[PDB]
Structures are given as structure tokens and as C-alpha cells.
Amino acid sequence: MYEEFRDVITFQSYVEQSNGEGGKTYKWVDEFTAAAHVQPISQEEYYKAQQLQTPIGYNIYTPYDDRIDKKMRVIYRGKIVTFIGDPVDLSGLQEITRIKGKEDGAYVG
């Protein structure tokens, strides 16, 4: 609902252990700090037709940073969200990275 943005926001991680046991106990760590824009999808982004569901998708652009959605828990403009994703670069000179991330779950949490 911000459209075009650049604020100083903090990217962090919530990971349910740094070994092959996803659950049991949970540990918090900090990733990086950047001038960035993390925004939620709202609906289908382009809209056109309609459709309804509860939003579990994020859209982000940061200049050359690929670390936002790729298993993280970030705080952008006071909002804490959890998501997994894949980064793509804009190309040419290599100035902008465009990332998509989404949330699902893991059994109980």
C-alpha cells in the first residue's frame, strides 16, 4: 500500500534450529540493515478478475541485496513477517534485485 518506497528497515532471521531438526527449540539472529522496500501482495497484485484468500505473499525490490526472502523473518516499517523465496536481478548494469517470497508453514509451526 506504499507503492514506491525506500526506508531504513531491519532484516532478521527466526530459524527453528541451525541443524537438521526443524522444530524442538527456536533461535533468533540478525541478518543485515538496508535501504529497501518490502511490500505485501494485497490480492493478485494486477487484480483484473478478482478472487479471495488470506494474503501469504510478498513482493520486494532492494538495490543489489538478495537476502530479504530466502528463509527470513524481517521487520519493514514496523511490521514483522515470516517468508521463504527466490531472488532475481533486474540485469544490464546490475543495480536492482527483484525478490518474491511467500509463507506456508511446517507441521505445527
Side-chain angles (χ1 to χ4, degrees):
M1 62 188 80
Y2 304 99
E3 193 176 297
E4 181 57 61
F5 168 119
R6 280 189 174 278
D7 285 65
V8 286
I9 46 177
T10 299
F11 301 89
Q12 57 183 357
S13 306
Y14 185 47
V15 176
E16 293 72 61
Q17 307 184 180
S18 185
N19 52 38
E21 176 55 61
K24 196 178 179 180
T25 65
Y26 42 80
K27 297 177 288 182
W28 284 106
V29 298
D30 195 60
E31 203 63 63
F32 64 102
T33 35
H37 180 201
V38 162
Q39 180 161 231
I41 203 161
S42 66
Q43 194 187 21
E44 303 190 306
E45 198 189 308
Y46 193 50
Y47 311 130
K48 301 301 187 181
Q50 60 214 247
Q51 296 184 232
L52 190 56
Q53 182 173 291
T54 308
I56 53 175
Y58 277 69
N59 309 120
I60 157 274
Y61 97 80
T62 303
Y64 213 67
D65 207 293
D66 299 73
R67 204 65 174 173
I68 302 73
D69 315 310
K70 195 65 172 295
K71 215 280 182 294
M72 300 291 163
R73 187 151 188 169
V74 303
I75 177 163
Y76 53 97
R77 207 65 182 266
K79 303 194 300 303
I80 311 85
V81 77
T82 178
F83 45 19
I84 203 273
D86 293 296
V88 188
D89 311 301
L90 195 140
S91 309
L93 70 175
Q94 297 192 53
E95 186 175 64
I96 296 169
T97 294
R98 189 172 181 182
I99 316 183
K100 54 182 181 299
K102 57 185 292 184
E103 59 182 354
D104 295 296
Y107 310 112
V108 289

